[PDB]
Write a protein that binds this ligand. Sequence first.
Ligand SMILES: Nc1nc2c(ncn2[C@H]2C[C@H](O)[C@@H](COP(=O)(O)NP(=O)(O)OP(=O)(O)O)O2)c(=O)[nH]1
Ligand SMILES: [Mg+2]
Ligand SMILES: [Mg+2]
Length: 424
Amino acid sequence: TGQDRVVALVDMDCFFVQVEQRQNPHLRNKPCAVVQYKSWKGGGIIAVSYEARAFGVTRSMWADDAKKLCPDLLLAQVRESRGKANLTKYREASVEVMEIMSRFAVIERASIDEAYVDLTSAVQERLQKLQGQPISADLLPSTYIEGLPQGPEETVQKEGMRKQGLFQWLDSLQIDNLTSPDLQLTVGAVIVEEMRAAIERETGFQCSAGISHNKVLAKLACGLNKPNRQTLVSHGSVPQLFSQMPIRKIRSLGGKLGASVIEILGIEYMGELTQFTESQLQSHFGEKNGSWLYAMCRGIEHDPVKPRQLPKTIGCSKNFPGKTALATREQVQWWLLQLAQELEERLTKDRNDNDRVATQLVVSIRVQGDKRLSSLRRCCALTRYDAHKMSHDAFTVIKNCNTSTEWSPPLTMLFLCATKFSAS
DNA sequence: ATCGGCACACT
DNA sequence: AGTGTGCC
Ligand SMILES: Nc1nc2c(ncn2[C@H]2C[C@H](O)[C@@H](COP(=O)(O)NP(=O)(O)OP(=O)(O)O)O2)c(=O)[nH]1
Ligand SMILES: [Mg+2]
Ligand SMILES: [Mg+2]
């Protein structure tokens, strides 16, 4: 079936922008982006409001270039600490949202601004409490039903379409059977409406949600009606939805694997995957992937929503690209120390707030003219949350790397990460 | 010089 | 353990 569970995916809209907009009222309802490291081309853009997007502004764009596209664009700068970007403000805002969501159901923190929710149980409970009662259209004020309306002047308006689709969906719904997968999705959507309302009221942040039977579909659904809307993707909408759906849009298919599927199989849409047998797919892409693709193109995925609200690892890194690369011993030690200081500050907060300690410290370095993203990876024991010792240990482990009071080759990157957390 | 940052599969 | 991928 693949209609066994109810899963939702919630994602904040232009999250960093919202954080800056809440803190500054002036940036509200204006085109704006968030940038870091202004010196170079005005800084790199990592977050763009929807007002700015209408002008074509995107992340990974230089602020100066963005200005050319959008003359009145307002910019917000990431806090800078110890010579590197500090994402503390956004991490704290993130916790706020996660905490509200946690109240409604067990969630999986997928990223800083999105979380997966398994509502299977909550939906069942709700059904019992409102048992025998129809679902009013009023309960789903921002819900879109994928694939509707269908068949037969309101439609010209976006809102008109949404209302008509929802009416058709609700009208079709049979209150009589609790078991119906579609009914459970509708109830789950009501819960997500309530959850989204709570988030907006308590944090002031707007967000979008996708409600479906699995995480991949939920994610896909979420992206359909951004921003400030939630989309319900039923099992039945999948054939029509997937039929013109590019392969790269499915989660985890945006990279090389997706490209292999397209290149090898000679298809461009998700639906086209249905013709191939499971065995064929497994032979081309492996047993695990083959199984996943065969099931996925039919709208079925079984990956569980992990009950995890905390990051497994905590790391900080800095790039020194091109000329800026560190060529001296003293430089490497100084930067290692800076990294260690931020790490210690985050670690202490983690120990006090989450009551756990990290057992392993990981050091990563890159050198000039290296094809590999990570030039080297090393780990050492992390006995105490002390910056001086941590930097010294990292240096001790990577001291052997230098080929030549000078360092050679110069280092493109420094990376420290704390891992292997244990209860304390 | 599109940065810093997470999780996972594979060996 | 260390490497490589994919995403936010
Ligand atoms: N440094 C950095 N931060 C990033 C990057 N990509 C995203 N972020 C940070 C900054 C982002 O604000 C935040 C959330 O990631 P999204 O959900 O993928 N995009 P948003 O919520 O902005 O918009 P919407 O969801 O409505 O399209 O993660 C990046 O490539 N680099
Ligand atoms: Mg977002
Ligand atoms: Mg996101």
